[PDB]
């Protein structure tokens, strides 16, 4: 993964409950076999992209040492016989060969979703794609060292078959962090950036409400424009305040 | 379709322009004003050999010294003709004297705008303005003989000649050269018909034309058909002897 | 639009009922002869085991 799973910290609740669903059956399939319950099947990330959404998906894969495999859903839309069948199967086959692996399927409303009404207008290409996903999961085939992860802007948009257990058992939500949560994420973010002793973490956290990892990252870079401007090689309280107020202004 | 508040770029509603197009598809009406008379000719038009003459209106009396010629739809001019008679009658009751050509025209054209569910001290309630233009002629003691062109768009121009129709092109250009300050009433009628036969593609006759004039000698007089035929017959000789 | 008729049907199954009516019609029928007639026509437009 691009980053480890304790360096994005201040998403910690979501870190915690992704870690025990995904990492543990991959590392230790044995505990789930021994109990006699199924290993987990599918996990869902929902919420706006870049709320630290992308972080959490990259980050679970790093710790396992899985390969993260990004699949564009539209490309799964070939207009030939069984090409569409072929592509899904091959990812599933490769997931078992190169195990452990995360097959990350981004957007499940270019190959799934609930459509216009699920009639025929060119909504059968979409229907063929979803049918394939549903048949492998429900059937004799299964997910064990292939984990599949769905991503969707809002979860209510997904077929209720996908909403059943035996497709997706784990459904994680990504909200706006806590003030405590913002605080932990900022200290991490500002740490790796070189700065003067006179920097005030305390001031920025107080000004920030409704900030995701991305919004903290903007405050560092915005300050940095003022810091080339003020003829320095390091970030200072003067650069920090201005930057924090501007990122606040542009948004709610 | 089209709103009663939806303009073109120039300030002008769709509906107003569109009326003005249908006007031009009517029948040809030509009026020439001098200071010896105003002569009005129209093509009456026979729509069949079994359509009776003088049952179709093209020369109407607003008052006994005041006429109008129409072009467009004939029913649409009826609401105007009604308003014009009423205006004339009322002014004479109140003031015991004649309405001026201008005054009369203004009164009809104020109520030809309208349309929509609007109001501002003017009652507007029409679905469309009228589809018809009329050439309103009269003589008044002060200004004598005058001719006015009424647009149903609430617009009014004072004129000394105007022609409208589908024959407008030939007739206005001919009218400019033919215009003079005074010339005899008999020469003028003969000359009007000459202009009409030119823009007309077919033989001109009295079963599709009616003439009319306005005199200070005896007020609004429709120059009737029998008398008009004898002039058309002279027309055939004078015209094939310039050729 | 309105018309007068000597036998007509309206609502569903106008064609079927009207066709039969024109055929059995008479002008020496009595109330009871009509009822019998009426009851036949109604039967032939309704498909059932029985009509109650």
């Amino acid at each position: 993964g691009e980053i480890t799973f304790d360096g994005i910290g201040g998403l910690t609740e979501q870190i915690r409950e992704l870690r025990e669903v995904i990492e543990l059956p991959l590392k230790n399939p044995e505990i789930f076999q021994r109990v006699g319950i199924k290993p987990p099947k599918g996990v869902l990330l929902y919420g706006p992209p870049g709320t630290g959404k992308t972080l959490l998906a990259k980050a679970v894969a790093a710790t396992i040492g899985a390969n993260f495999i990004f699949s564009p859903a539209s490309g799964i839309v070939d207009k030939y016989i069984g090409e569409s069948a072929r592509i899904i199967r091959e990812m599933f086959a490769y997931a078992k060969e190169h195990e452990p692996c995360i097959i990350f399927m981004d957007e499940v409303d270019a190959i799934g979703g609930r459509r216009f009404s699920e009639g025929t207008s060119a909504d059968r290409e979409i229907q063929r794609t979803l049918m394939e996903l549903l048949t492998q999961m429900d059937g004799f085939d299964n997910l064990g060292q292939t984990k599949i992860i769905m991503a969707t802007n809002r979860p209510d948009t997904l077929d209720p078959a996908l909403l059943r257990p035996g497709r997706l058992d784990r459904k994680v939500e990504i909200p706006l962090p806590n003030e405590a949560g913002r605080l932990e994420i900022f200290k991490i973010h500002t740490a790796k950036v070189k700065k003067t002793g006179e920097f005030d973490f305390e001031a920025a956290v107080k000004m920030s409400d409704g900030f995701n990892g991305a919004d903290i990252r903007n405050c560092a870079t915005e300050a940095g424009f003022f810091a080339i401007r003020d003829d320095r090689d390091h970030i200072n309280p003067d650069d920090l305040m201005k930057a924090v107020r501007k990122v606040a202004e542009v948004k709610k | 379709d089209r709103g009663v508040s939806t303009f073109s770029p120039e300030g002008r509603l769709f509906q107003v322009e569109y009326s003005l197009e249908a006007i031009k598809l009517g029948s040809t009406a030509i009026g020439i004003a001098t200071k010896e008379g105003v002569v009005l000719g129209v093509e009456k038009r026979a729509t069949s050999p079994l359509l009776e003459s003088d049952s179709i209106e093209k020369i109407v009396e607003i008052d006994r010294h005041i006429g109008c010629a129409m072009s467009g739809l004939t029913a649409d001019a009826r609401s105007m003709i009604e308003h014009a008679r009423t205006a004339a009658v009322t002014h004479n009751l109140y003031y015991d004297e004649d309405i001026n050509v201008e005054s009369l025209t203004q009164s009809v054209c104020d109520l030809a705008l309208r349309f929509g569910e609007g109001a501002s001290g003017e009652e507007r309630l029409m679905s469309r303005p009228f589809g018809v233009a009329l050439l309103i002629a009269g003589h008044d003691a002060d200004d004598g003989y005058q001719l006015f062109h009424a647009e149903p768009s609430g617009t009014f121009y004072r004129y000394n000649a105007k022609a409208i129709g589908s024959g407008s092109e030939g007739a206005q250009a001919e009218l400019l050269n033919e215009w003079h300050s005074s010339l005899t009433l008999k020469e003028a009628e003969l000359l009007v018909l000459k202009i009409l036969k030119q823009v007309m593609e077919e033989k001109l006759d009295e079963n599709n034309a009616q003439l009319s004039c306005i005199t200070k000698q005896d007020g609004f007089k429709i120059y009737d058909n029998e008398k008009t035929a004898e002039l058309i017959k002279e027309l055939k000789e004078k015209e094939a002897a310039e050729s | 639009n309105y018309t007068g008729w000597k036998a007509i049907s309206v609502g569903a199954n106008t064609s079927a009922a009207q066709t039969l009516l024109q055929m059995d019609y008479k002008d020496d029928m009595k109330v009871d002869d009509a009822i019998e007639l009426a009851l036949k026509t109604l039967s032939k437009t309704t498909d059932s085991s029985a009509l109650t």
Partner: protein
């Protein structure tokens, strides 16, 4: 020597001694990396050459001289000067300012600082008066009119297409003080979603070649390029942008006065009475393109034989209008 693909069927030696250019998708033979110095030769087989597209190999023996790489119709100092050009006044005035006056005085435009329009795009009913109007201005300045048919530029062979475009612009520079009239530009294609739909590769080669030649090194002061289009909204972005297309001209329909004149011009061939007036037919005629006026004229004669006379009266002209204009239903 035409060759657009050149097998020599396993003449074998070897370093080298096969020296065969195949340009075909199946089999890509590249003899690249600059020079091979040869007196005459790639290899043998009646077919020393380097196809229509060259994988290096700097041109032994004539392979890209091919019999028709031109087929368009040039008319210097056109026949047309006034044909269907009546009541085209707004269109005609634009052509005068854009084309006529810089040709007439190149020095005045230079001194001012401005460029006359590099390109003109002409839309509206096409060839009904459009091509005619273009020929009328050209004749007046004595400027070669070059009429190129969009559809021909659609040859089904390799480059065959890039061949033709190139020689058309070479001709324009030689004969300069001249108009290149392109009827269709959607025959050789503009914007579409059908490049991924697996065929229109041949089309794409032509399109790109065209853009390159024009903007690249064609002088655009006297040499005018005129484009004609059937859908004004289907231009490719390269085509659209200023520096290539400036002036966008409307087709102008013959007006009442204009239609009467065109009526006189076309009846000079016909055998009809001259005592009638053209004007009369025009009042009954509603807004009609130059093509329709011509259609009235052939129809009055068919009417005339039907009514059993060998002259056409006014009355045949009136009937002939009634028939063509209802029939047309546009």
């Amino acid at each position: 020597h035409p060759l657009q693909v050149a097998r020599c069927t396993k003449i074998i030696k070897g370093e080298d001694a096969k020296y065969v250019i195949n340009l075909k998708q199946i089999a890509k033979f590249v003899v690249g990396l600059g020079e091979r110095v040869s007196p005459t030769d790639i290899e043998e087989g009646m077919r020393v050459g380097v196809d229509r597209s060259k994988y290096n190999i700097e041109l032994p023996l004539p392979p890209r001289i091919d019999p028709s790489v031109t087929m368009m119709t040039v008319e210097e100092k056109p026949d047309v000067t006034y044909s269907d050009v009546g009541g085209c006044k707004d269109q005609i005035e634009k052509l005068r300012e854009v084309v006529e006056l810089p040709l007439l005085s190149p020095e005045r435009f230079a001194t001012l600082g401005i460029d006359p329009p590099k390109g003109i795009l002409l839309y509206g009913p096409p060839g009904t008066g459009k091509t005619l109007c273009a020929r009328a201005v050209a004749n007046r300045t004595d400027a070669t009119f070059i009429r190129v048919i969009g559809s021909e530029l659609v040859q089904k062979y390799v480059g065959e297409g890039a061949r033709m475009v190139r020689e058309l612009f070479e001709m324009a520079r030689t004969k300069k003080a001249c108009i290149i009239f392109f009827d269709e530009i959607d025959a050789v294609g503009g914007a579409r979603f059908d490049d991924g739909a697996g065929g229109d590769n041949e089309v794409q080669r032509t399109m790109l070649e065209l853009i390159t030649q024009l903007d690249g090194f064609d002088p655009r002061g006297n040499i005018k390029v005129m484009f004609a289009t059937n859908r004004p909204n289907t231009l490719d972005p390269a085509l659209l942008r200023p520096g290539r297309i400036d002036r966008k001209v409307e087709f102008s329909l013959p007006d009442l006065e204009g239609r009467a004149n065109i009526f006189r011009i076309h009846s000079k061939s016909m055998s009809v009475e001259r005592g009638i007036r053209w004007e009369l037919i025009s009042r009954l005629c509603p807004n009609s393109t130059g093509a329709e006026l011509r259609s009235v004229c052939t129809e009055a004669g068919m009417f005339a034989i039907r009514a059993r006379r060998k002259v056409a009266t006014e009355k045949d002209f009136l009937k002939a209008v009634d028939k063509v204009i209802s029939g047309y239903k546009k």
